[PDB]
Amino acid sequence: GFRPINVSRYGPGNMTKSLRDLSWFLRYTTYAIVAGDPNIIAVNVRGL
């Protein structure tokens, strides 16, 4: 039941919050790798 969403139906002000999250999902993954503990991934994702 998944379809890829179009940008024109979505909105440019709506997707500029969206695309920075995709860097932010791995920016905290790079933070947690050098932190040596996955707690910061596993606490900022619950209920997102």
Binding site: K17, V43, N44, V45, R46, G47, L48
Partner: protein, 169 residues
């Protein structure tokens, strides 16, 4: 905590008097609005878990400094804490709306709130905007339910504004 009835008790108890004509007409002025108080308090809690969600998305779409890494609403550790710390301002505004005065707001939420937020780095600034986005709104769901709105249903909200925010002028 301290009702509009019980505030008028120790407005009269400390001088040692009975209930005169001014006591019998100011208290009747509270009771004629009591049907309008309670039915407004139902529809405020109609979608109160939605009402904080519509306000803070309208807050953070209005002040986008508080999302991008700046002041503290950055992670969901902050953001879901922000929605809870918003939700106390909605929930205690229901109590003083029923209680008449703002003395429930005076010694449950207001005392120490300048000193809790300063110890965390939480700004007092957009918190005033966060109550300013609710007090005008809260009035939308009172208006769409058909209850009149004005004198009160703000009596509580700007007492959370004029006493929390620091005096400039």
């Amino acid at each position: 905590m301290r009702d509009a009835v019980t505030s008028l008790i120790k407005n009269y108890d400390i001088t040692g008097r009975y209930l005169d004509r001014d006591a019998i007409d100011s208290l009747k002025s509270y009771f004629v609005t009591g049907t309008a108080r309670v039915q407004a308090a139902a529809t405020i809690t109609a979608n109160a878990a939605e009402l904080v969600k519509q306000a803070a998305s309208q807050l953070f779409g209005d002040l986008p400094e508080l999302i991008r890494p700046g002041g503290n609403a950055y992670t969901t550790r902050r953001y879901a804490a922000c929605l809870r710390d918003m939700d106390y301002y909605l929930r205690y505004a229901t109590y003083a709306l029923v209680a008449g005065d703002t003395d429930v707001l005076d010694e449950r939420v207001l005392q120490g709130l300048r000193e809790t937020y300063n110890s965390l780095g939480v700004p007092i600034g957009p918190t005033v905007v966060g109550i300013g986005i609710l007090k005008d709104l809260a009035t939308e769901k009172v208006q769409a339910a058909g209850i009149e709105v004005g004198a009160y249903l703000e009596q509580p909200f700007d007492h959370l504004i004029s006493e929390l925010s620091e005096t400039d002028v």
